[PDB]
RNA sequence: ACUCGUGAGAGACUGCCGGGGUCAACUCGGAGGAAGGUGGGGAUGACGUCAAGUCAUCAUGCCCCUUAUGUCCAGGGCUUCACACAUGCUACAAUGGCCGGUACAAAGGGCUGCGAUGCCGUGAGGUGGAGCGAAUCCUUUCAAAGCCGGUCUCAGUUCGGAUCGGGGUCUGCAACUCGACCCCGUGAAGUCGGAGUCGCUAGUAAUCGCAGAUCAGCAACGCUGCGGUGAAUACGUUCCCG
């Protein structure tokens, strides 16, 4: 319908960096398999925690798993108790040893993935969806410094039978411009009536910064 | 992509012709690649999310 | 001396300056035995016929790539820009006749969902 | 008059075969120009506390070139009736329009 | 033709059958070989999946693999 | 000329004139005409009866021809149609034997078309 | 001689990494060949971009492999130590031949 | 490039052996696809066979046949109101050379000589005298044009 | 030194001159220039449509099975065939076939992989392992159409290869149902195709080989790409289609 390519996959050569970074000849399928099982292992407890980014640098078979989140304090509970448990399970599930770096984003309302987190987690919690969309926005535009704001919510909105898509915005979100620095995040709400897939586009600025 | 078949394609088969690829992320039997070990859908979604190192969208 | 590089479709040719009574050295061969088609024989000597130094100029060339005709048109180009590199007042007389200008026409990219580049699969709607 | 009858996602009852044969057979009556007919029977709307939307597509190579023709209706017989009314008028027009 | 396929289960069974000079109807799974002419005379209940068809083996069967003296498909047309 | 049983034409070369027999194609003509010594470029009008003698004795001696291949091919097809093979079933029903496509093509075995 | 052939995905990181190797061996002092571009390899993978029936309308994903070369002549172990001592970008794999 | 106006056309180099626009254009219309070199061997061999059967300059024989097949009026196509009207229209120079060479090649290709060289030689010769079928197609095209002169007024 | 390989940079902006422009945009010509006016091609699909597609990639609400609608294996089927459609490939020959000699590519692929000289075969291939994780070694120094020469004389043929018989090789536990390839024979339809209809505006159409992914093997004539040789025509919006 809207045949819109994932813009983090449309600027992954130009502005947005890769999330996983190594070099691999004849070891690549194994590094893919470990990358997948690591991201499944970091889905659940960190999606409780407020995860945004999961980068995996990979040096000579050590591993370096780095996570950008919005609360160091739920990811790091008691020191080593909440960190070294998921870290140690990453050390056992992989056949390797894990150096887990955990870091905070300076503004959670600035990331499109975390905006999709807070919106969809509100939308599972029986709030008004137009009220939710408005809440995430306006406040986000000011927060740090955003130029774009696109929030599309499809699915059983309000528990209705029809799957109505909604489309709210503010400012400038140019997708066809490649010097855009757009963050994109889709996260899917889980109501009892079903799943409300939320897409958030956030246009930070014109800046190439090449 | 049933767990009996996802699990059965990872054991040691009783003949060498019987071992097939079966994409790791979902378990999709047809259209699996060898260098990635991912089917075309998991290649397209993971390569869109920048999760695969340096495969990117093509234009020559 | 004065060399040069002539680039046609995927061919490329390298020539050099030289003054002598008529000789043409391709990759170990003569011009009449490397180009048996007699039309490319005009297509390469036409810059020599324009600024009329057909016999008063002999030089050897080395090439690469293309097919027959890409190397022919490339060697036209390299003779022409070499004749810039002999006398610059030969240069407005070359460019006027249609010369010194390599043809940027290359075999374009095949497109997905087509038999060739610009050829749809022939569709009979019912 | 070669008559291919495909589903789309649907059973094809002996009532549907016979009815298809007789509506489309109207066209064999008066348009001698016919060749192949291709007839394909979609079934959505179903499953949604609502009434199923049928769709019929019909392809027809005349003697000469290719008609197509598409109809959506709450039931199947009413839809195929309607489709044959349309086709009959068209063809006589492609019969029509000419004759000096 | 390095070595033709032999059906080792049927091979063990066949040898036992011909050493005792006993002939018995055999319910055989094997559709793959009529390897030696040691199989001549033995009745093979060939299994096309669904039932067993008795097949007498004579001298002309050598070189035809065992399964398709019994066909797997049924076709009439009307 | 006359040979093993195939009437040779007026003006054909020898490597084509030998081909008109049931047992000989082009390669057998290139090997027979190399073994015996007749020039392949010789026409049939210019053919010698002693060349018919040596050529004829060679290709009835060391190779098989019309009656041997027609009775041999016929006897082998009826061999596999007597014993009850699946290829015997294909030769019975008039279907392609190699297990190839039967749904649309293989019209050269079913033959002329009847349409229902 | 110790010939280092380094491969990567980023031309920028392999150019700054080659600047680290040239600044390293040149800093310790030796005869060193500068960065030589071996050309590439591209893996082009055509993906039917649909969960279901749309064989046309693809998207094809390439894969760039950049190959840089630095040939080292006259090795001294004070220079050889700094090879295994630091590698900064670590998206580059270094073949020591 | 129609509906935007006239489109610029490629300039055509002349012949190496004979030195004419019309010889090279005959070559590019001889070109059953792929083999321009073989098209040059057909055209050249056919024009030296025309040189054998004339003993003169072959391009003069070619331009005299080209003149004797070249039409002046062409019929077409406009159907005003439920009747198809053959409308006669003045033929441009390039259109007339195109119909001359294209008819020459195609009706040489229908002719029953052994090779293509003998076909094209005999068709250029018979069109030079005026005895080919292509000259009869010129006379049938002027037959349709002069038979349909009245409909030509539309000024179209 | 020339290429070439890959890094950085210059270069096309109606910038410069002539005319129309309301002295506005913009358009017609000229110069310089490798290129002239979005130079060529990509990647890039707005708000929405069609209850279009997919609960079989995945995820999933609800309903159903839980002694089976789970699961394990052998054999069979997904390849059946009086038919009808659809996309392709090889053709119907002399611009051609067959034999001999000879010249020019681009891109790619390679670890329990790619595998050379040599030897055994007619040939698939066998024996053997040089050498390479590869601008190096191997895919032969890479092609085929091309050119030079000979033969064939318009014919159901030296066209055409379907089919069928015999004889093999390789892959695999296993080529019967159901693999490809080679050798010998066999040698059918087919004489440019009714109504109609499809593609394409320049390195395009047309034709010629080459590589790749999937893959032990292959139904590859497919798909994705690479290059070779290379045309005709466009008067123009009346008509058909959007």
UniProtKB/Swiss-Prot annotation, chain B:
PANTHER family referenced in this protein's UniProt entry, alphabetically: 30S RIBOSOMAL PROTEIN S14, SMALL RIBOSOMAL SUBUNIT PROTEIN US14M
Keywords: Metal-binding, Ribonucleoprotein, Ribosomal protein, RNA-binding, rRNA-binding, Zinc
Disulphide bonds in the chain: none
Function: Binds 16S rRNA, required for the assembly of 30S particles and may also be responsible for determining the conformation of the 16S rRNA at the A site.
Record-level GO cellular component terms: cytoplasm; small ribosomal subunit
Organism: Mycolicibacterium smegmatis (strain ATCC 700084 / mc(2)155) (Mycobacterium smegmatis)
Cofactor binding notes: Binds 1 zinc ion per subunit.
PROSITE patterns per the UniProt record, alphabetical: RIBOSOMAL_S14
Lineage top rank: taxon: Bacteria
GO-annotated biological processes: translation
Membership in a protein family: Belongs to the universal ribosomal protein uS14 family. Zinc-binding uS14 subfamily.
Entry binding sites for Zn(2+): 23, 26, 39, 42
Assembly and interaction partners: Part of the 30S ribosomal subunit. Contacts proteins S3 and S10.
Molecular functions (GO terms): rRNA binding; structural constituent of ribosome; zinc ion binding
Official protein name in the record: Small ribosomal subunit protein uS14B
Cofactor(s) listed in the protein's UniProt record: Zn(2+)
From Swiss-Prot, chain C:
Domain of life according to the entry: Bacteria
Organism in which the protein naturally occurs: Mycolicibacterium smegmatis (strain ATCC 700084 / mc(2)155) (Mycobacterium smegmatis)
Gene name of the encoded protein: rpsI
Keywords: Ribonucleoprotein, Ribosomal protein
Ribonucleoprotein as UniProt keyword: yes
A Gene Ontology BP annotation from the UniProt entry: translation
Gene Ontology terms for molecular function: RNA binding; structural constituent of ribosome
UniProt KW Transport keyword: no
GO CC annotations, alphabetized: cytoplasm; small ribosomal subunit
Protein name: Small ribosomal subunit protein uS9
Annotated family: Belongs to the universal ribosomal protein uS9 family.
Curated annotation (Swiss-Prot), chain E:
Signal peptide as annotated in the record: none
Keyword Oxidoreductase set for record: no
GO cellular component labels: cytoplasm; small ribosomal subunit
Any GO BP annotation: ribosomal small subunit assembly
Domain of life: Bacteria
Residue ranges that the Swiss-Prot or TrEMBL entry lists as coiled coil: none
Entry keyword set: Ribonucleoprotein, Ribosomal protein, RNA-binding, rRNA-binding
A GO MF label: rRNA binding
UniProt family annotation: Belongs to the universal ribosomal protein uS19 family.
Function of the molecule: Protein S19 forms a complex with S13 that binds strongly to the 16S ribosomal RNA.
Record protein name field: Small ribosomal subunit protein uS19
Source organism of the structure: Mycolicibacterium smegmatis (strain ATCC 700084 / mc(2)155) (Mycobacterium smegmatis)
Underlying gene: rpsS
Swiss-Prot record, chain H:
UniProt keyword list: Ribonucleoprotein, Ribosomal protein, RNA-binding, rRNA-binding, tRNA-binding
SUPFAM superfamilies the UniProt entry points to: Ribosomal protein S7
GO biological process annotation, one example: translation
One cellular-component annotation, GO: small ribosomal subunit
Subunit structure: Part of the 30S ribosomal subunit. Contacts proteins S9 and S11.
Name of this chain's protein: Small ribosomal subunit protein uS7
Role: One of the primary rRNA binding proteins, it binds directly to 16S rRNA where it nucleates assembly of the head domain of the 30S subunit. Is located at the subunit interface close to the decoding center, probably blocks exit of the E-site tRNA.
Xref: PANTHER family: RIBOSOMAL PROTEIN S7
Superkingdom field: Bacteria
InterPro entries found in the cross-reference section: Ribosomal_uS7 (IPR000235), Ribosomal_uS7_bac/org-type (IPR005717), Ribosomal_uS7_CS (IPR020606), Ribosomal_uS7_dom (IPR023798), Ribosomal_uS7_dom_sf (IPR036823)
GO molecular function: rRNA binding; structural constituent of ribosome; tRNA binding
